[PDB]
Amino acid sequence: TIVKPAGPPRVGQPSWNPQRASSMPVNRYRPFAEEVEPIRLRNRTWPDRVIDRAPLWCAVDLRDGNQALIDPMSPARKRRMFDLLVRMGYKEIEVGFPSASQTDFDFVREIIEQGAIPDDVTIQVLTQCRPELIERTFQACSGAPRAIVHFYNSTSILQRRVVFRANRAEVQAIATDGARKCVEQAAKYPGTQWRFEYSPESYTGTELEYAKQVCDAVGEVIAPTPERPIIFNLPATVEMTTPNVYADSIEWMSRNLANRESVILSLHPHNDRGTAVAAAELGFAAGADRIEGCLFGNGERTGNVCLVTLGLNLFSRGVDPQIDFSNIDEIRRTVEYCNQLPVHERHPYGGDLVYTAFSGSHQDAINKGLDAMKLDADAADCDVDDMLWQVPYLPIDPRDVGRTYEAVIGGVAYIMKTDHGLSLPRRLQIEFSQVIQKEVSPKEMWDAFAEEYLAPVRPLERIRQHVDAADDDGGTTSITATVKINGVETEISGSGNGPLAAFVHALADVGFDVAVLDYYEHAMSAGDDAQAAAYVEASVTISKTVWGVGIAPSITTASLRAVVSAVNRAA
Amino acid sequence: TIVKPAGPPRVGQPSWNPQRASSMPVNRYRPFAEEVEPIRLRNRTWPDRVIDRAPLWCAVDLRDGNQALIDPMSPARKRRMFDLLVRMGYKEIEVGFPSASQTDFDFVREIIEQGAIPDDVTIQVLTQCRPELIERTFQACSGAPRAIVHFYNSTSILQRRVVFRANRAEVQAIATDGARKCVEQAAKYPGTQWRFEYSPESYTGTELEYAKQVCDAVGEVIAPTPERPIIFNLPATVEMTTPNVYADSIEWMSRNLANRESVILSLHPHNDRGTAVAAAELGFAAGADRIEGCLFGNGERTGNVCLVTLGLNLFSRGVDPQIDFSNIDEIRRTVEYCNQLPVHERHPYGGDLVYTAFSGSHQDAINKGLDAMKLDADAADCDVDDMLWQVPYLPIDPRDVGRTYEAVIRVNKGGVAYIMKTDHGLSLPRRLQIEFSQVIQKVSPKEMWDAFAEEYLAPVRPLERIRQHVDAADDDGGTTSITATVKINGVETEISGSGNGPLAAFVHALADVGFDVAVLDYYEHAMSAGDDAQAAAYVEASVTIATSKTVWGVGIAPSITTASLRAVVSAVNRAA
Ligand SMILES: [Cl-]
Ligand SMILES: [Cl-]
Ligand SMILES: [Zn+2]
Ligand SMILES: [Zn+2]
Secondary structure: OOOOOOEOOOOOOOOOOOOOEOOOOHHHOOOHHHHOOOOOOOOOOHHHOOOOOOOEEEEOHHHHHHHHOOOOOOHHHHHHHHHHHHHHOOOEEEEEOOOOOHHHHHHHHHHHHOOOOOOOOEEEEEEEOOHHHHHHHHHHHOOOOEEEEEEEEEOOHHHHHHHHOOOHHHHHHHHHHHHHHHHHHHHOOOOOEEEEEEEEEOHHHOOHHHHHHHHHHHHHHHOOOOOOOEEEEEEEOOOOOOHHHHHHHHHHHHHHOOOHHHEEEEEEEEOOOOOHHHHHHHHHHOOOOEEEEEHHHOOOOOOEOEHHHHHHHHHOOOOOOOOOOOOHHHHHHHHHHHHOOOOOOOOOOOOOOOOEEOOHHHHHHHHHHHHHHHHHHHOOOOOHHHOOOOOOOOOOOHHHHOOOOEEOOOOHHHHHHHHHOOOOOHHHHHHHHHHHOOOOOHHHHHHHHHHHHHOOOOOEEEEEEEEEOOOOOOOOEEEEEEEEEOOEEEEEEEEEOOHHHHHHHHHHOOOOEEEEEEEEEEEOOOOOOOOEEEEEEEEEEOOEEEEEEEEEOOHHHHHHHHHHHHHHHOO | OOOOOOEOOOOOOOOOOOOOEOOOOHHHOOOHHHHOOOOOOOOOOHHHOOOOOOOEEEEOHHHHHHHHOOOOOOHHHHHHHHHHHHHHOOOEEEEEOOOOOHHHHHHHHHHHHOOOOOOOOEEEEEEOOOHHHHHHHHHHOOOOOEEEEEEEEEOOHHHHHHHOOOOHHHHHHHHHHHHHHHHHHHHOOOOOEEEEEEEEEOHHHOOHHHHHHHHHHHHHHHOOOOOOOEEEEEEEOOOOOOHHHHHHHHHHHHHHOOOHHHEEEEEEEEOOOOOHHHHHHHHHHOOOOEEEEEHHHOOOOOOEOEHHHHHHHHHOOOOOOOOOOOOHHHHHHHHHHHHOOOOOOOOOOOOOOOOEEOOHHHHHHHHHHHHHHHHHHHHOOOOHHHOOOOOOOOOOOHHHHOOOOEEOOOOOOOOHHHHHHHHHOOOOOHHHHHHHHHHHHOOOHHHHHHHHHHHHHOOOOOEEEEEEEEEOOOOOOOOEEEEEEEEEOOEEEEEEEEEOOHHHHHHHHHHHHOEEEEEEEEEEEEEOOOOOOEEEEEEEEEEEEOOEEEEEEEEEEOOHHHHHHHHHHHHHHHOO
8 A cells, every 4th residue: 555655854855845755665776877877978969959850760560569469460450550651651660570470470471472562661570680580580571672670689788697698799799690690691582672770679778888889790790881771770678767868878879880871870769767759859869860669659568659749749840750640530540450559548649638628718728829820811811721820728730630629618446445345346336336326425325335235134134044065075055044034033944056055045935036147256355364245146036137245254154145135135 | 531641852861761751731830949939058957967856746636637637526536636645745736726616616625624634735726817816716725724826827929929919018917916916815814824836827938038037027026035935837838849948948947037046946847749757857957846747647638747657767766756656556546536537558657568578588588587686685685675676678676566567478369368268267366367477478278278277276286175074153253163184295184273264264274284374365256157157266375385475276166165265275286
């Protein structure tokens, strides 16, 4: 549980800040400068540069995104994603990791053999540096008109130590041997226009001077030219610090890498700190050439940078993203189809609620803006739809992305579990939520729950019982119980496979035909001896289908009370 | 529909970049410097400042978040959100707009009158500057020990022209008249310690020299001191450009506002360009004192800056946020209840998928990271949970937020949870799914099922259970006792214990034979119905054998009683 922070305020903490120290283990975590290294960059210029052209975009939805999906893309979902990206304007598209996944291999084979790749589109495939994986990656691109082969190895301080147990030279050699293998394989495959991309993986946790060394050495192997450049792709595999620091890193690399005219400098930001878009836009101002991301920011854990956000951050400040988002609804509808994950309600530009105003005040200002625009448009013999957009609270004309401005005019599971320790089966929440419709407070809701499932002792009251279970696995269990039927003390008895069966059969003898449809039980604290909650759904005749709830210190008794509760609900 | 861009490349555009001009109407949109002004700050210092203290936080969930919801919070939802924020450690909470809505007025009365406000907590209320509204904002607050009155009016180039059709002088008087009224009203209620917050609303669409001018003006009326400071809140009402320019804007206001030592400088970013967190973090290094936001990014349109991301971004780089997030799921569940909007699967720190790894090589590197951390704790006679987190792909120990790392395995219409329920009728508890996933990691339906049987169902060593007699009390809350016949590494022994049901009894029985089984959790469900009906039981326990390990055990049987007993045996045996 959540414990109010209660430790001493910092020394020199303002009188007007009453915040207390928390007990979170901050000391397991270090500043970025200490975890990795301090900023090497003298005379940054990214903070003074405003973006005025589209980067080169590369969409990694088919590999990076797909790898991150609970339900990965079927071959049809892939074609549909591929085709959306092509039709939006993307010229570079990561289509798989052929050497690690047969489905990836077959998909690559499919778009090449089907003739599915437009003439201005380059496909990109991911590989690790092992010779047998490079080989198999080239195998998969066989007969491609042009391909990016993207090889990588982890270079961070952490990984060198704990993943590879390798020093700097050994780790540069993984990368440069990969590059040598790449040059070899490309000569073995004529006619395909081979292009290379190298990532120092976990770049954000790597010494810059070192990343430059590995990169430069890899460039020396490939021998790129201004005509036939290499891509150095520099990922925030984990987003580790603030975007200005990423950007300092990008500017430093851009300035220090050898043979810069032959390098396409590429960014691959993840969103661990919630700042992937910022890292990209500042990194772009820092001298990157290219950005890898996904539509709506799909990718492991927090995701890759959002391509859509980036593109429309350009459009809404007067820069052509060179990608069509004139119908963001279709884009979103297809991305959700392919990924089987929703775009959040608040996601920039695409989310359900982003062109909505609930505030009466905001709606008035929007309309006052919209009117001025029409007054200026009628006074210029003009279509408003071509005027400079000037509307408070709306950054863009919703129409420009195929949307519209919306001027818009029970908590059972939560409260029962939070306040009561009760995990109600879904169908029970449903059944009971209907009952609570006749707002009801938490204290109030509970009184109604108790009155419905816990209190009634008529027509059925269970007084006590003797359970005689078979000692042997699979034997039969006997119950004798003392019950009251409409006040009337009665003995009942039954046999069954276990005690709840025995009790249920026993009930037949007093005019309750009961059949267990569903049953759940859970602990109610930690510990050997804790209370149990039991939930029984039963059809009950003398034929209504009903839930009962039982709470008791025993698994058995809870379950028995759950049956009594059902029977009394049935009546 | 979507048509490929097909316009010409830009002039200068490199041969290796084949993109085409699109038909998007960019001409309807201008650079920020043209839309608003050029913000030049050649001598800025925010890029060289790393954050080393938590800001003063203010939570606006009950106002900016609430206004933004499809379904506004009921009184109960309001109260629940307010209590969560107190309990996390927020000391300033904006509780509503009580002059604008009766439900907000009512809420503010409810908390004041029922004594819900801690001594170290200062409630905040929003108001516009119309004197009837300022009066009603003070009335709402009658009998509060302290409160921040937050008044605002819009000051942007666009609204001054199209919304107000007004002079600079005109629009500034709206503000200073609001301030005057606040001062006169604060005198009518001596029982409350009043503080003021002023926002030039749509700040990011406003000339800086004008924002300063209006704020300075307001401060002259209110006359704050280092001991009674004013708040000046600078909203990115619409997030209009990149967070560096916002940061420049803050550093300049921090350096140039009159009476700076009597100013608490507050930031209030929205997320229209998806960079609200960056704005707040860069703006804080720029010299701000305070940040207004919402848990999980709720609020108007794209939302207010996420307080959880900000606070845990401090935590994970070694700065104490002074807010507890150590059960981020309790926070998530509560926020979802209150807002009735879900926290996205990939939301930083909190989304369902942020502590998972699907990648085989990530999974392998995570394990190597964990093993290496463990060898270092043993070498140092230390708790590994106490030491420097050093695991690739995981910025934090998920346990530090009450979460669990999950190596998610792919099952050949797929997924472990889904295949178990459908093929075998088992609803595995989430933490069992995680645990068993890890077993696999260390896949067809058959491989998965057989792996499952091999882990949890099959083992008869160390412990096996032949038979038992359970003696239940007839009367409720009586003792059950148990004798059981059991083979311990093949040697038949006899065991004895008592407990509140035969589960507990059986667990206590096993302690005489060198198994310390401490039940942490327990679940049971029906499989099938009738005479071909069975019970699935799952038990979580910390188990020690004659070194302690947390494991699940699964048991399946016709009896709800014997299923549970099987579960305990499965548990003891998984631990061995
Ligand atoms: Cl049973
Ligand atoms: Cl029990
Ligand atoms: Zn990646
Ligand atoms: Zn706001």
